[PDB]
Ligand binder design. Sequence first.
Ligand code: SF4
Ligand code: SF4
Ligand code: SF4
Ligand code: SF4
Ligand code: FES
Ligand code: K
Ligand code: ZN
Lengths: 48, 114, 83, 125, 206, 77, 106, 94, 688
Amino acid sequence: PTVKPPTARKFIWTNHKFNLSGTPQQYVPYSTTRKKIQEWVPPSTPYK
Amino acid sequence: TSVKPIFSRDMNEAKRRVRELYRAWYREVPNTVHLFQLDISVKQGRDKVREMFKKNAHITDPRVVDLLVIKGKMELEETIKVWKQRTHVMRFFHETEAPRPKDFLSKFYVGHDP
Amino acid sequence: GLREIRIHLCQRSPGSQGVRDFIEKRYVELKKANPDLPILIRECSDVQPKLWARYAFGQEKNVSLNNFSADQVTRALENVLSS
Amino acid sequence: QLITVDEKLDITTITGVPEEHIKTRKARIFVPARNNMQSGVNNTKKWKMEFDTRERWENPLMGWASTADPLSNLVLTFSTKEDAVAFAEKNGWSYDVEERKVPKPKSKSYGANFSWNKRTRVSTK
Amino acid sequence: RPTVRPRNDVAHKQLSAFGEYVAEILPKYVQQVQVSCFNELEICIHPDGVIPVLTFLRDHSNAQFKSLADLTAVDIPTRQNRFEIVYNLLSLRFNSRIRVKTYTDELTPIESSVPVYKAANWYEREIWDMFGVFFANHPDLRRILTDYGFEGHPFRKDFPLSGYVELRYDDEVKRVVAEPVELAQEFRKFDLNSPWEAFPAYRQPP
Amino acid sequence: VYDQVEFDVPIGSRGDCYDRYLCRVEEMRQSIRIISQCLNKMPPGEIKVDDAKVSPPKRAEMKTSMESLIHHFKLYT
Amino acid sequence: PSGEERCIACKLCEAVCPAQAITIEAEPRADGSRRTTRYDIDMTKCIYCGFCQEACPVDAIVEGPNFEFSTETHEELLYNKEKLLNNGDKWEAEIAANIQADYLYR
Amino acid sequence: GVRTSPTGEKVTHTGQVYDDGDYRKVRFVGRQKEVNENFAIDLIAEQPVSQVGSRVISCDGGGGALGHPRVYINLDKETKTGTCGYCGLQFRQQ
Amino acid sequence: SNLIEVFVDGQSVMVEPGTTVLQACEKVGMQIPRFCYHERLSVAGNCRMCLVEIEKAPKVVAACAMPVMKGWNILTNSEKTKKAREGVMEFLLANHPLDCPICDQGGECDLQDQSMMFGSDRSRFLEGKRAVEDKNIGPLVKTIMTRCIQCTRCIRFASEIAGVDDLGTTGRGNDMQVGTYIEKMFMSELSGNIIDICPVGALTSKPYAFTARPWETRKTESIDVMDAVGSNIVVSTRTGEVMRILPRMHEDINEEWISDKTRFAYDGLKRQRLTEPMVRNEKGLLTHTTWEDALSRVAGMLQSFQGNDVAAIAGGLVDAEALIALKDLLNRVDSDTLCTEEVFPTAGAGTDLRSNYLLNTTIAGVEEADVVLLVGTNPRFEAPLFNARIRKSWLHNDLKVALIGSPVDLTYRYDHLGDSPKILQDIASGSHPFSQVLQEAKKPMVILGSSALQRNDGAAILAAVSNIAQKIRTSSGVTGDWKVMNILHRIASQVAALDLGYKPGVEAIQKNPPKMLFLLGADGGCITRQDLPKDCFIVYQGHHGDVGAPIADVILPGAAYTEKSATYVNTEGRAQQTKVAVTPPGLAREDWKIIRALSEIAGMTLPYDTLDQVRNRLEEVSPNLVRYDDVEGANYFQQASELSKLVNQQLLADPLVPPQLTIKDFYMTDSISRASQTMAKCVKAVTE
Ligand code: SF4
Ligand code: SF4
Ligand code: SF4
Ligand code: SF4
Ligand code: FES
Ligand SMILES: [K+]
Ligand SMILES: [Zn+2]
């Protein structure tokens, strides 16, 4: 890379990170989508 | 309605092979319980053999009966020659299975399945 | 007491001929006499004609009207109506 | 040396299927409807056998769709409804059969677009 | 034409004549003889002819199919006899291959071909294991690929892809146990068939 | 193109483990002999059938031609 | 180069994946763009065959040059979209150079 | 466009965030929630609109065969820009 | 006798005169490729994809348009035919945009697939492509007109099927563009069907946009419940989620179309859902509880009351299984107050004779009628697919249509006789000139709207319409087998409830107010607590929190129509069943099971434990309810007509005004569509 530097992009990490497995920085999977079914919310005023 | 037989030409011949298989399984259970160091009693093992024969008591086709006996003899050979391990023999008893609900209300509470 | 009447019959089968005759002749006079009783006439192809009577607390009885004449049909209604 | 077996063909005891997935399942025997998004009719030739849909739920970890139904993806193909019915009966599945729907022949006439005195005359092309 | 597979009329003619030759000699068992556009000869026979037909092809001086390449089954549920038994034979003498096909259902035995080819032993065990076709007079018929006590014949078209049970280690009983299968992610069924016909040459009559 | 390369087939005489071992060692040598011919007789041209209903088109074509994109889309779905 | 995602949620990768290791959901983004809301790769289902990067029409999904990413847990190998975008931002410098070296063979 | 919910959990570019009573956020305790900080929706809005002198323009996303399939964009409407369906770049006619 | 012999690749086939070359090919199982041709539209002959060689004829002919001649041999796979297809496909793709990855049609695109099967495998087009500007035509249909191939299917569909002439082509040549010219929204109750018929991705569902690909969807064949037409549908699901609704072809019901409400209201199933049992806490607020706690509380009240003290109301989306389950449970405490929200006059024969409340002619019998009299109905919005049937007969059979009621736009010209109910007496008396039109007619059809019977004098209207039908039959200008009298229903559940013996309307509840009231999906507001004793115990069972649920003492979450295998009977009396596409959300349960579980807890176990058994129970009450897809005839119009004359009741001076007069009234009519964000965007679009 001293002779042929990489192309610069604004979103490329400026700071490299090594393998973070087993540390507090480890990746933890989760669902990235939002709730699909919306529940009816009962009224807050009585009228049974 | 004219078919090739497997072993038995009619149900009377087939029931003879069934009873012989039952005798072979009946006598093997004490050796199985000892050989595999099973924690079930011999009575439990023979009860399981009886249960397995009785769920097929309704079959009237000698060819179907023959195949159940062929398969039943394969299972016996797997047990006697210790090709099975302890886990295989214990699979008949479903010990880690939580009891499944039978009556309508219990099924209704737990999910949608019949 | 009686709560509901249901008459099943086929549109075409000869086994429902008497029931068809009863409806075409006497159902109107039956309905005038019992203006507040549900008499559910339900036709379906190739069904056995039948009479269903529903009484209090969900007790139901059914009577076969197969090959009944019209007068036999009339008679079977009267046993149900009286009871 | 053939033998006579008058009994109905019943193989439920030698197929290895657990009981709950014989008695409690409802097989549907049908010819799939044409996908209305396309005019090709080639996926409406054969008879299909599929089973009743059961619960799918979200996996807590990823949100993937989980199932406990071993037959959820089971689809069988048949030349005729009679073959499908035969297969369902010997396996002991309760089934429903839906008559094949075929489009009725239509009367098409390009000339009718320009009728002298009928409403079939088109206002544009 | 560079992208098209060339035909071989010579091989097609030779195989067609041999197909008629086998049919003339064993009319008691031969039901159909066909040759593919890529020149593979198939003999379709009544199941009673397995031993005589295979024996003839092995030992006859104009056949000499000494090598059994493969023996397998195909499950076609829509057929009354759902199982197609396929023998693929090789003749080193005549540098040729032949395919013999018969059929059976769930309850009708087929005769073991072990007397004709010793190679058939394990192939028939595999067919029994994966399809439940019983072979009569087999020296040692039993499962070969599946687990001990495994229920079902997995290569049948109506056997589910992920099966009915799955294994884990349970600490309470200190052994591996089997339980009904539950999948975190269900296998996703795809409908890929185009609704437009691809091959007019294979169109079936209406 | 195996009919276009020259090689010998090793053959045993005793049918035992040793002759099969010698057959395998000699087959490696013959493989080198074939590999040598493949390197020298390697022809130019394309490397998948020029039929885009079977083999996918090149990526550059897929990104410019309508037919290529349709065929790419269908071949991969 | 602008920072916009290349992936347009065509789902060709998901269709071709021999292991069914890809799971995708999508909707119109707030700006109307066609974009994914789920893009998961189960790296323990994946067979690292590269069929997904061949199928992608826009070079969105690639197999990069990293091979030193073993983990202490199974769950860490179930990648979601965030994980995969970070890998893209982490490795793009090398990935762009490798694609440059080989795209004329594709 | 990273913002945090009242609970302090980062909202992703897909709008995901565990709500207050969701037990599932326990997976992040002692660990961290992977969130990519470069929201594409924000970054593509930074690019200037390109002025062209034609009714129809084409886009391949740049880099020729390294971009996306070439599409042609109509620029007749004067009340909005032409946006590329693949890369989101915008065009407007002089 | 009239058939002529033609050959398809040398195979003899006998066809009617006028049969096209394309139709002759389909008789031997070959499908000629097509773009512009559609069997339910007028022939166009503009795509040229269907060109085919006729043996010994130098010129290829358009198969879709060309009538076949005797002795013709159609060569559907000759070199001339194949090369015509390749050339035409090359022309179609020359300017088509490279959009497949971002285009929603990909994977189910006729252009893609016919390119694979009949087109070339590469391009030789070296120019720039055409690009077209997009047209906004409303919130349902997204347009990307660069993909348009100018097949004119949408234009023909809008003109002929929908009766809307707002689509066309402007310009000429390569610049010809489909659209409206002006900025106009194409809002028709049948508008969403142009998505299905557009062969390409030019017209797509805006709600569906980008969400799925066709190969990953599971297809569940089911039945629409947004009206009483019983339109056959396919529910597309993926990974346990309903993704969209498509038409399922049924020649005798909806053909291959569905209404916009059927197509796009499914999004209402993802919101306002009841997912847990709820009871009132000490403060009078609904709080989540278990099924055990909820059903125990209901069972206690049901054991304490008997007779008239217990009543039930069935809403518009209730399945037949739930209906009989609830009727049986109430019958077991000797309650017969099983009511519906929709009213049907109980005078005369009431519900004793099916013919009294059925569309007796059937949907497909509209095509045989020569005159149709509509009374007090806006069929365009009450039964859109039924109105489409009338227009088809109007278009192709020259059908004469007259209307008594508000002069609404039916998409075809009709004779407006007025809105006064008194006109019915004029027609029956012979004074009105239309009476002679009815007498001259061979196959007249009279359709009274169920919406008209919601009036207080609905009994008099039904008698008057029945009276007109009786004169037509007595006059002997009609054949015996043809049926004249018809009721057009609008509620999916109404006919099944009437078959099962439910009381139409809530009049019995108003007469004898109950102490315990079951609301089985009843969201119409017909009975409120202002009509009930002070401490009435109200149990709501349904899938949506809308109108009924906020006033209930107990909420039992049920299944929606996508979430159960349930029986529904359409306005013809045809029994049809849905299939489970996704399971009910949360703790929700199948409707008939809830009542069955409640009956056991209350000590009155119902005698069925499976879906098959509860359907055996239905057969015992009304055998037609288990004859799926069958239309059982209903007779005895004469007996119902005689009983209708026993009690003379007065028509009111009020004009007959349908509940829906314009499109804005169409989009939201039940709990599901009221909860649909897509339906809300449609109301906003057509009002503002
Ligand atoms: S490399 Fe992995 S994710 Fe990509 S197609 Fe192959 S198995 Fe699927
Ligand atoms: S990664 Fe590529 S192939 Fe996969 S969905 Fe995104 S654009 Fe399509
Ligand atoms: S309409 Fe068909 S061919 Fe055109 S971009 Fe869409 S999927 Fe591709
Ligand atoms: S928008 Fe679609 S249906 Fe209408 S003319 Fe264009 S391609 Fe045909
Ligand atoms: S289908 Fe005949 S010209 Fe279009
Ligand atoms: K479309
Ligand atoms: Zn671009």
